[PDB]
């Protein structure tokens, strides 16, 4: 029964330090990093860095390519809490077939653990479903009373 290794899933091994690095900046206010994109390398299972900067949410969505599965990691402050919260977005281009959308979902479980701290999770697909307000509207949603 043992042929592959696990059953198709993200590796994040080749670009270990790389990926982690982009994840350490987005969480560390010390360095300049408001967002962080992570896309595959070639045509195999292996998530790597795609883009990083302090442009905010406007620059993050600008990198999002409608057609390929990517991961966006932004860091903003809540309205009431006023504290730095971590947001997780599962960019899923519409151009991607259905057979793939179901095959990439398995990777979400692996990536989800890697990008811990995510106070809120959002599964968008289009650029309109990943706008500053569209995200900030969910960032505020959280425990407060009752």
Say which CATH topology domain 8-140 has: Severin (3.40.20)
What's the CA gap between 70 and 40, in Å, rounded?
Answer: 8
Among positive and negative, which fits the CA dihedral 26, 19, 126, 142?
A: negative
Give the technique used to solve this structure: NMR
Containing 48, the helix (H) or strand (E) segment is: strand 47-53
From the list 22, 30, 107, the residue with the least C-alpha distance to 72 is: 22
d(CA 68, CA 96): 6
| Sheet with 84-92: strands ordered across | 47-53, 35-40, 69-77, 84-92, 118-122
Q: Which residues pair with 47 in a beta bridge?
A: 40
Question: Please, are residues 72 and 130 in contact by the beta-carbon 8 Å criterion?
Answer: yes
Handedness of CA 59, 37, 132, 32 (dihedral sign): negative
Instruction: Give yes or no for a contact between 131 and 61, defined as CB atoms under 8 angstroms apart.
Output: yes
* Alpha-helical segments (H) within the chain: 16-27, 57-63, 98-114, 132-140
How many angstroms separate the CA atoms of 64 and 18, rounded?
Answer: 19
102: which DSSP letter? Answer: H
Question: Whats the size of the chain, residue-wise?
Answer: 146
* 52 secondary structure, DSSP code: E
Contact 45, 9 (CB under 8 A): yes
């Amino acid at each position: 029964g043992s042929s592959g290794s696990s059953g198709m899933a993200a590796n994040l091994s080749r670009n270990g330090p790389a990926l982690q690095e982009a994840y350490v900046r987005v969480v560390t206010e010390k360095s300049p990093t408001d967002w962080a994109l992570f896309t595959y390398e070639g045509n195999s299972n292996d998530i790597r860095v795609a883009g990083t900067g302090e442009g905010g949410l406007e620059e993050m969505v600008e990198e999002l390519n409608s057609g390929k599965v990517m991961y966006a990691f932004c860091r903003v402050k809540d309205p009431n809490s006023g504290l730095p919260k971590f947001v997780l977005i599962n960019w899923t281009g519409e151009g991607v077939n259905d057979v793939r959308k179901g095959a990439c979902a398995s990777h979400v479980s692996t990536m989800a653990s890697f990008l811990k701290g995510a106070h809120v999770t959002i599964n968008a697909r289009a650029e309109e479903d990943v706008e500053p307000e569209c995200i900030m509207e969910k960032v505020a949603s959280g425990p407060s009373s009752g």
